[PDB]
Amino acid sequence: MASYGQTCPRPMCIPPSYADLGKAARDIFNKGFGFGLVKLDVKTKSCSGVEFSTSGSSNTDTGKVTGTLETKYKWCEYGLTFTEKWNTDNTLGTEIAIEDQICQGLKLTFDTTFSPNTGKKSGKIKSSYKRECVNLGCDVDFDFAGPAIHGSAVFGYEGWLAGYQMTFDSAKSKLTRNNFAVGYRTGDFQLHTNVNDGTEFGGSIYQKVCEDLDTSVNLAWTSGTNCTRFGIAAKYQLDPTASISAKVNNSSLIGVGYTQTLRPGVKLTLSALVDGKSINAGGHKLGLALELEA
Amino acid sequence: MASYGQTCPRPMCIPPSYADLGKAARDIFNKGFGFGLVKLDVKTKSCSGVEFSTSGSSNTDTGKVTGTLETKYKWCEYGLTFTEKWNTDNTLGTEIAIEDQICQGLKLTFDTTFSPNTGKKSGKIKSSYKRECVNLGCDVDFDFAGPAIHGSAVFGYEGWLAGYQMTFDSAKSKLTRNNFAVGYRTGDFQLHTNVNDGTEFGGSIYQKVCEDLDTSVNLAWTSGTNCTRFGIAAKYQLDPTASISAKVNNSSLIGVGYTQTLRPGVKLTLSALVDGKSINAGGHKLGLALELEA
Amino acid sequence: MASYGQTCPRPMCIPPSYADLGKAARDIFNKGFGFGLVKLDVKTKSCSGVEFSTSGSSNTDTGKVTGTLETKYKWCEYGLTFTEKWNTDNTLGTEIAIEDQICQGLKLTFDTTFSPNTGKKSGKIKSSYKRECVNLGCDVDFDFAGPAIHGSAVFGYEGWLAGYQMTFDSAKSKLTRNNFAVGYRTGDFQLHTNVNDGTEFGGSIYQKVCEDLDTSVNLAWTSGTNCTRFGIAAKYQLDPTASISAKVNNSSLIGVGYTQTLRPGVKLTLSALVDGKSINAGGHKLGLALELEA
Amino acid sequence: MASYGQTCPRPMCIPPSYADLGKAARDIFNKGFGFGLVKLDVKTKSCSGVEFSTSGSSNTDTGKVTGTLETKYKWCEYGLTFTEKWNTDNTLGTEIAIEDQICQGLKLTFDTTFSPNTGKKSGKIKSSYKRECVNLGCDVDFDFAGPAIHGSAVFGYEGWLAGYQMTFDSAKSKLTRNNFAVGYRTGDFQLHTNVNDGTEFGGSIYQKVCEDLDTSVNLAWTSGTNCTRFGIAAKYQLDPTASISAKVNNSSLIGVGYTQTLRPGVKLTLSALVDGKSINAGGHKLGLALELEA
Amino acid sequence: MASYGQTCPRPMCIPPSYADLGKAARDIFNKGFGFGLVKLDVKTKSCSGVEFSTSGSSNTDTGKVTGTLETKYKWCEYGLTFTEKWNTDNTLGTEIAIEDQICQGLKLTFDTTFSPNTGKKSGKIKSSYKRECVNLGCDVDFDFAGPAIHGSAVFGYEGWLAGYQMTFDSAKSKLTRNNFAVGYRTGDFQLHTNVNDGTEFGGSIYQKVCEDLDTSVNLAWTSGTNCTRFGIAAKYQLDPTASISAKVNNSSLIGVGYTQTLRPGVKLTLSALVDGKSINAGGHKLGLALELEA
Amino acid sequence: MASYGQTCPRPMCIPPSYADLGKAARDIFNKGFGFGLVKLDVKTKSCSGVEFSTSGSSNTDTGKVTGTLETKYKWCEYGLTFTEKWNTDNTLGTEIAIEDQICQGLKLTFDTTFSPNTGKKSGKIKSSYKRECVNLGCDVDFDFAGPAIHGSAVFGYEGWLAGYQMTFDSAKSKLTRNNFAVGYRTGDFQLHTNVNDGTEFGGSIYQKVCEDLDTSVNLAWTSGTNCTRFGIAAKYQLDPTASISAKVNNSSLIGVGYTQTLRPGVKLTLSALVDGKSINAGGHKLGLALELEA
């Protein structure tokens, strides 16, 4: 038996990171929609252990066309991942990730970025620990007149979750953000509630309804006022190579979308947003995306 | 077989004193850090049965430089220890300890102190009894318009602990403090919860994670309010002659430290505290300590 | 038979890199001389697969004494070399080289450097491919408001060589340097001619004369003028543990030097430069170096 | 046959360092006497490769009691010695020595010292080369507004010795001290003469007289005057575990001393100095020392 | 072989003390004559290690009869001599001598005297060192408003002698007397010349003439004048138990004397002085002495 | 049967001298304590019949360091003791004692002292007669404008004692002191009462309590007043090489002390005095003494 420097079970006795709380509900509301943009994603791999990914994007509301290119090298025998990246704003950088090299359940990542537009150099060091019933870590952001420290932890028991996230500014030695959350998760549904700085509140519901149907509800409100926001969304698997999705915001905003697999490895997504009830006499938006993986 | 005036097993079937409850977790949070101070510890011994110890200390937040010098004589054949002490505030004194002389598991200590700064004389008499599953005792503080009586006891069973601590003022014939605690201990972990006077509550978790890694969690809260405090700490053995430690407080205070053995008998410790997120724009503190044992 | 991702013969059917063109002639003019400096080179190895190297240096014309220390780890079973480095200007760094891991004849190197004097971080990624009759590659320099791209290639046939070297500045998207070279090589002699940016021209001759005698000639000139420079040098093996060298520059500068093996593994070098014809009534320089390898 | 980076014979075809010239005569005059002080030397070793040494000292003419403690680690397989040190003035430090690691006959030592009394940090780098008929080296002292360079060399032939020592101040770029010496050595006797800066002159004679008798003569004088100083000393082995010594200074100062081995590993030394002819009506001094080695 | 704290040969490779220079010539002129006095010397010894000596004396020119009594104890096993003394002027005292106890050739003596006539107490400490070719020492006289220091040394080579004697007054810190001498000695003759304070000069000749005949010459003169003094003396062994002596002074003073052994252990001496040429019509003097040793 | 000039039995049918009345009680109160002083006692003997004793002493309340040296010669075959003495105040002297030489039970002592500090000479003649049931004698003190006569006698019967002591001044022919005493003695206890000049009264009780325990009581009072003084003391043998003692004075003065034999012939004594009840806020005193007998 190999020795251990830390112990953990297989998922899902290990909780989500703070950032992942509510992810399933969020994916129903976010994935499948691309309103206002045209996106192009080309992914390829080589047997040498290198993956490539290029992502193009055109924003209808700015007229700007942008994109990012990444190359990733996977040292499977070491637990090391090396990434090279470039984008259209001439920002370039390198990322190095370490997994289970120090102790089991430990992930360490170094992110260094440079931008010749100004000559600015900056970066981040991330650390994350996964163990039975706990998911904890911290990102430290190194920049001019920084660093900033972003700590977090989630813990749980018998499907119940709770946790926090805090951001500190070391140039002031002050806390600038303090978020908290609670919830419950199982295979069929997830329930989440949270607060940001004691002022912004909200939550979400994720629910499996049928084998082909995933639904969710988002809630939000602001302390000191009577303003509340909400919405409902769903994703329906039409067939093995097709799906539809839609969502309705309390502000009468209705999103729709459709994804179709054209060929295994090839997926096409179309979507649109309508401003009710003034349609088509308002801010109608459309989107298109094509993804190809080799 | 020698006769007995009291009986006890070898540790650890004998519980910790009330004061020692949670010690392992506390050491992770306290040892290895010296923020704000420079400390110098010189220890020597002689084959005549005398040990000497001198401890220097400089506090960055006051500008004061202080220190203490002690001489200890060990009468190994009698179970008696005699200590002479002096410090920079001109306080001088004598301590006499008696171990297993009266009955097995019994420790008696006499502590007499004098300060020419005022001419004040005061002292303490301590008594502590160790037996199977019980650790009980009392310190009596003799001073002007005293004495005060500080009693305590811890008991346990199959790794479970419980106990109390009480302070009485004999000049009033009243109880002034009443502390309680419960917990569990084993080789791999310790769990402790306590209360002071029914108002201050808290606890701690000690956990061995890996052979080279010791971690802990501290909790605290105050009755009548919603104020809670907490923090997480760890100590990692980098190599046989080096270690690192760190701790994070809920108030965004991050402590770091490093200890290195320079030579067997010689240890160097460096540490610092950063006030997140305003760093370096806040109350940054550093520490340094060197210890030499002959 | 192992598969191949690239093919090459044994040297010397594989040409030198652009940087190595003319190396043999250059070594006669450079090696064996240390005018103006005192140098100390200590090299050691351990059976654990680690090599150490420390190099001290004192420059008579500045009064500065400097040096560098390196540690190298050779993963012979992987084709990987890991280097740690530090120097007197407080520059520190890490280098990782990969050889024949991707495909045969391919060398990849990652060079990361940090200097706390300013907090600056920078580095290089190098790639070099060796194949029958071709030696090609590129160094990319990543820095503030960079990167710079330094490409090169040498090719040949039946002893004949030709190649180029180009430097580009990606922050401008311009070529900044374009060097070209031609030549011929065999066991007994080498002939090289080159040009830098169409303005600086030069070349060299390497010739074996006798078993104990290596000689060479350097030539240079600048476009737009009548200024030419040249010199002649030689190295003579006096005996198995001793050698002498000398060189004469067209500007009447005469270099001399002597190397002696004191013990296998131990070499002592002395040298001097005289400013003719005003000697000793001019800028006379001396040098000394001792190298020990364990 | 192992390779060599330098060559040397066994002693004594390798001369003493400049500092060691006249050492045998000096030991007769210095060793065995401790006038005015009480000294205590405890030395111990452990099979783990660590040696410990503690030295106490009481000076009758100041009333001060002081001392030093050192720990030494011997990496016999590497040629490396690591020393940790502390003393009563709160000065602490580390020394690292390297022997025959670079090349044969080469010794390199790094000495770093810190004193919290002021917070001052300083140190030295030493280099010494031993070869047939030559002993050369240099100590560089790194301090505030330094460094100072202390160079030296001794050479010889057929028992004859000669050499020099020079100190330079790099903050001035000037020589501050220039010492020279000549002499002769054999098994039975040694003759030494020297000069410091052209002003202070002196010398010594060492002579074996009988198997149990070692004698010596010291001479000194100052340029520009008629002032001369001298003295004669001897050491006599009374028996295998006892010896006596004495010395007479031209200023009528007579030193006496006696050493006795009490047990192998245990040595006791007593000594005294009398101011002739006014005895006992003058500055009579006594000394005592005990040394124990385990 | 016993150890040595000092070394010396047997006499006569060790010179006489300053006070002993010329002693042989002086004995011819002094011994055997007792003009003007009657003397009685009784010496006894006991097997217990105690010697006694009583000396009576009557001076014809004063009419006073005096005497001294001494008791001496010889601690042969220690090298210690203890003497008790009393005389007719009521002066009493104690003397302690130490020989070869400290180091070989070293003699130390303590002389304490008391006189109830006045109640005065005073004394001397003497130190004398005998070594090959050197005889050195010092007497320190401790009295009211003293001490006085009387230093001396004699050295020689191949029969040649030279030396000095100086007296200092420590209450003034001045030299009060400075004597010098030179000479030659062998078995057959001795030659001595001296000076006291640069003013008084003189010398003597000792010569063996025949087996039964010892002769000598005394010389003296004073600086600043033409005054010289001299005389010639001789001692003749008449038979094994009888001898005659005589001396003539330049001032026409002729001394004669005769000694006879009456019985072994018993000696009778008669003598007279005649004032030439006015005899018997001048200051004629006679003497008588009897000595008995048991 | 030898003739007798006086007759007496063996002790204790012969009473103590007046000065020895109450000695056992006094020793409990005096011996074992040295408050305020450091004392050093070195005693040696030689087989030649000479004993030496040197006693050093440092008084904390004056800062003066003093001492005495004595040499004693024992003429065992004669009944004669001869003592030579010197001390730090430059007082010197001789003592001669005669025992049983005149008649049995008779002791005669001559004590002569001189001090060069003034030139003063003085002394004493003592005479003491021991017989069945009587102990009588007289000391005569001879000094300037003296002598003084100090007579005494003690007599007894069946354990009962009585006696007197008187001092007369012969320069006045008057009695100056007249002391009287009565008491009882046995092996287990002693009772004593006395009066000095009819004004000072007191007494003591000595009692053996246990084999290892000796106790006593002191009483005193002054005629004409109501002032009384008293105290209680004890000595306890802790073991064959250790003892403790203590005493309490009516004026709240508590003395403590401890003696330990370190080695046969070597004894170490520590002691202290505390001023009750103001401790430690009063005239606390400590003492130390070491005695070595060879």
CB atoms < 10 A from the CB of B139, how many? Answer: 18
Q: How far is CA E57 from the centre of its chain?
A: 18
Return the bridge partners of C50, or none.
C46, C73
**Hey, what are F205's tokens?**
């009780």
The one-character DSSP state at B279 is B
Q: Are A163 and A180 in contact (CB under 8 A)?
A: yes
If phi over 0 gives left and psi between -120 and 50 gives alpha, with beta otherwise, what is residue F119? left
Strand (E) or helix (H) holding F30: helix F23-30
Residue of E nearest to D209 (CA): E7
Q: Which residues of A touch B254 (CB under 8 A)?
A: 149, 168
Q: Are A245 and A28 in contact (CB under 8 A)?
A: yes
Q: Which residues of D touch B263 (CB under 8 A)?
A: 50, 71-73, 82-84, 94
In three-state secondary structure terms, D18 is helix
| Among the listed residues B216, B217, B219, B190, the one whose alpha carbon sits nearest the alpha carbon of residue B202 | B219
Q: Are B167 and B146 in contact (CB under 8 A)?
A: no
Q: Which residues of A touch B251 (CB under 8 A)?
A: 175
Do F92 and E121 count as a contact with CB atoms less than 8 A apart? yes
Q: How near does any CA of chain E get to the CA of F125, in Å?
A: 17
CA dist list (Å): E265 to D111, E28, E291: 81, 22, 8
If phi over 0 gives left and psi between -120 and 50 gives alpha, with beta otherwise, what is residue D141? beta
**Hey, what are D185's tokens?**
């050595």
d(CA E101, CA E110): 14
Do D6 and C264 count as a contact with CB atoms less than 8 A apart? no
Q: How near does any CA of chain C get to the CA of A67, in Å?
A: 18
Give the burial string for D276-291 (b: 16+ CB within 10 Å, else e).
bbbbeeeeebebebbb
Residue of A nearest to C169 (CA): A116
Omega cis (within 30) before F277? yes
Q: How near does any CA of chain D get to the CA of B48, in Å?
A: 13
Among F45, F80, F89, F121, the strongest candidate for a mutation testing the E interface, having the largest count of E CBs within 10 A, is F121
Residue of D nearest to E151 (CA): D277
**Hey, what are F106's tokens?**
């008779």
Q: Is residue C272 part of an annotated ligand binding site? A: yes
Whether F contacts E, i.e. 3 or more CB pairs less than 8 A apart, is: yes
d(CA E70, CA E87): 9
Place of tokens 């808290």: B202
In three-state secondary structure terms, F18 is helix
Q: Are B221 and B228 in contact (CB under 8 A)?
A: yes
Return the bridge partners of D226, or none.
none
Residue of D nearest to E137 (CA): D277
CA dist list (Å): E45 to B285, E78, E184, E293, F76: 92, 19, 38, 8, 21
Do F114 and E118 count as a contact with CB atoms less than 8 A apart? no
Chain E interface, Cβ < 8 Å to D: 1-6, 102-103, 125, 127, 138, 140, 147, 149, 151, 170
Q: For chain B, how far is it from start to end, CA to CA, in angstroms?
A: 38
Do B263 and D94 count as a contact with CB atoms less than 8 A apart? yes
d(CA E259, CA B217): 116
The one-character DSSP state at B34 is -
Q: How far is CA D110 from the centre of its chain?
A: 19
The one-character DSSP state at E20 is G
Residue of F nearest to E116 (CA): F121
**Hey, what are C147's tokens?**
């990167």
d(CA E170, CA E173): 5
Residue of B nearest to F278 (CA): B121
The one-character DSSP state at A117 is T
Q: What is the DSSP string of C90-146?
A: --EEEEEEEESSSSTTEEEEEEEEEETTTTEEEEEEEEEEEETTEEEEEEEEE-TT-
Strand (E) or helix (H) holding D28: helix D23-30
Nearest-5° Cα angle at A194, A188 to A195: 175
Rounded to 5 degrees, φ, ψ at F23 are -55, -40
CA atoms lying within 13 Å on the CB side of residue F2: 7
Q: Are B193 and B203 in contact (CB under 8 A)?
A: yes
Contacts of E158 (CB under 8 A, 6+ apart): none
Q: Are E138 and E150 in contact (CB under 8 A)?
A: yes
Whether C contacts A, i.e. 3 or more CB pairs less than 8 A apart, is: yes
d(CA F207, CA F187): 9
**Hey, what are E43's tokens?**
């010496």
Residue of C nearest to A117 (CA): C145
d(CA F126, CA F130): 14
Q: How far is CA A151 from the centre of its chain?
A: 17
d(CA B87, CA B73): 18
Q: Are E199 and E224 in contact (CB under 8 A)?
A: yes
Contacts of E171 (CB under 8 A, 6+ apart): E145, E146, E147
Whether A contacts B, i.e. 3 or more CB pairs less than 8 A apart, is: yes
Task: Nearest by CB to E3, from D244, D256, D278: name it.
Answer: D244
CA dist list (Å): C232 to C249, C253, D123: 7, 11, 47
Q: Are A160 and A154 in contact (CB under 8 A)?
A: no
Domains within chain B, CATH numbers bracketed:
18-293 (2.40.160.10)
CA atoms lying within 13 Å on the CB side of residue D241: 8
Neighbours of chain E (3+ CB pairs under 8 A): D, F
Q: Is residue C20 part of an annotated ligand binding site? A: no
d(CA A192, CA A26): 11
In three-state secondary structure terms, B19 is helix
Q: Are E163 and E183 in contact (CB under 8 A)?
A: no
**Hey, what are F64's tokens?**
């003066």
Do A116 and C171 count as a contact with CB atoms less than 8 A apart? yes
**Cβ pairs bridging D and E (under 8 Å):** 38
| Among the listed residues A261, C32, F89, C262, the one whose alpha carbon sits nearest the alpha carbon of residue D132 | C262
The one-character DSSP state at D169 is E
Q: Are E291 and E266 in contact (CB under 8 A)?
A: yes
Whether A contacts E, i.e. 3 or more CB pairs less than 8 A apart, is: no
Q: Are A199 and A224 in contact (CB under 8 A)?
A: yes
Q: Are F257 and F33 in contact (CB under 8 A)?
A: yes
Q: Are B287 and B272 in contact (CB under 8 A)?
A: yes
Give the burial string for C90-119 (b: 16+ CB within 10 Å, else e).
eeebebebbbeebebbbbbbebbbbeeeee
| Among the listed residues C140, C116, C112, C119, the one whose alpha carbon sits nearest the alpha carbon of residue C128 | C140
Q: Are D68 and D83 in contact (CB under 8 A)?
A: no
Strand (E) or helix (H) holding D25: helix D23-30
Whether B contacts D, i.e. 3 or more CB pairs less than 8 A apart, is: yes
Residue of A nearest to B211 (CA): A5
Beta-strand ranges (E) seen in chain E are 37-46, 50-59, 64-75, 80-87, 92-99, 106-115, 120-131, 134-142, 148-157, 160-169, 174-185, 189-196, 200-210, 213-222, 228-239, 242-249, 253-263, 266-275, 285-293
Q: Is residue C255 part of an annotated ligand binding site? A: yes
Secondary structure tally for chain C: helices H, strands E: 1, 19
In three-state secondary structure terms, F155 is strand
Task: Nearest by CB to C145, from A48, A112, A116: name it.
Answer: A116
Resolution expressed in Å: 35.0
Rounded to 5 degrees, φ, ψ at C96 are -125, 120
d(CA D245, CA E4): 9
Give the burial string for A64-96 (b: 16+ CB within 10 Å, else e).
eeebeebebebeeeeeebebbbeeeeeebbbbe
Q: Is residue C275 part of an annotated ligand binding site? A: yes
d(CA E63, CA E149): 36
Do D276 and E138 count as a contact with CB atoms less than 8 A apart? yes
d(CA F112, CA E1): 47
Q: Strands C285-293 and C37-46, how do they pair?
A: parallel
Do D116 and B38 count as a contact with CB atoms less than 8 A apart? yes
CA dist list (Å): C49 to B35, C73, C81: 40, 6, 10
CA dist list (Å): F177 to F149, F169, F200: 10, 9, 12
| Among the listed residues A265, A245, A264, A263, the one whose alpha carbon sits nearest the alpha carbon of residue A255 | A245
Q: Strands B285-293 and B37-46, how do they pair?
A: parallel
Nearest-5° Cα angle at C19, C17 to C25: 105
CB atoms < 10 A from the CB of A186, how many? Answer: 11
Q: Which residues of F touch B85 (CB under 8 A)?
A: none
Neighbours of chain A (3+ CB pairs under 8 A): B, C
Q: Which residues of F touch B119 (CB under 8 A)?
A: 281
CB atoms < 10 A from the CB of F144, how many? Answer: 8
CA dihedral angle for residue A61, residue A63, residue A65, residue A66, rounded to 10 degrees: -50
Among F45, F47, F48, the strongest candidate for a mutation testing the E interface, having the largest count of E CBs within 10 A, is F48
Q: For chain D, how far is it from start to end, CA to CA, in angstroms?
A: 38
d(CA C152, CA C164): 6
The one-character DSSP state at A116 is T
Among D236, D243, D248, D254, the strongest candidate for a mutation testing the E interface, having the largest count of E CBs within 10 A, is D236
Q: Are B294 and D41 in contact (CB under 8 A)?
A: no
Secondary structure tally for chain A: helices H, strands E: 1, 19
Do D239 and E103 count as a contact with CB atoms less than 8 A apart? no
Contacts of F64 (CB under 8 A, 6+ apart): F58
Neighbours of chain C (3+ CB pairs under 8 A): A, D
d(CA D201, CA D223): 8
The one-character DSSP state at B278 is B
Omega cis (within 30) before C280? yes
**Hey, what are A223's tokens?**
């302390």
The letter for the amino acid at F133 is C
Do B279 and A173 count as a contact with CB atoms less than 8 A apart? yes
d(CA E237, CA E245): 9
Say how many residues make up chain A: 294
d(CA D67, CA D59): 11
CA dihedral angle for residue A83, residue A87, residue A91, residue A97, rounded to 10 degrees: -20
The letter for the amino acid at A53 is S
d(CA D93, CA D108): 17
Do B294 and D116 count as a contact with CB atoms less than 8 A apart? no
Residue of C nearest to A120 (CA): C144
Q: How near does any CA of chain D get to the CA of E5, in Å?
A: 6
The letter for the amino acid at F15 is P
Do B42 and D94 count as a contact with CB atoms less than 8 A apart? no
Task: Nearest by CB to C145, from A48, A112, A119: name it.
Answer: A119
Residue spans of alpha helices (H) in chain A: 23-30
Q: What is the DSSP string of B180-249?
A: EEEEEE-SSEEEEEEEETTTEEEEEEEEEEETTEEEEEEEEEETTS--EEEEEEEEEEEETTEEEEEEEE
Q: Are B162 and B181 in contact (CB under 8 A)?
A: yes
Residue spans of alpha helices (H) in chain C: 23-30
Task: Nearest by CB to F120, from E112, E114, E119: name it.
Answer: E119
| Among the listed residues D126, D80, D114, the one whose alpha carbon sits nearest the alpha carbon of residue D99 | D80
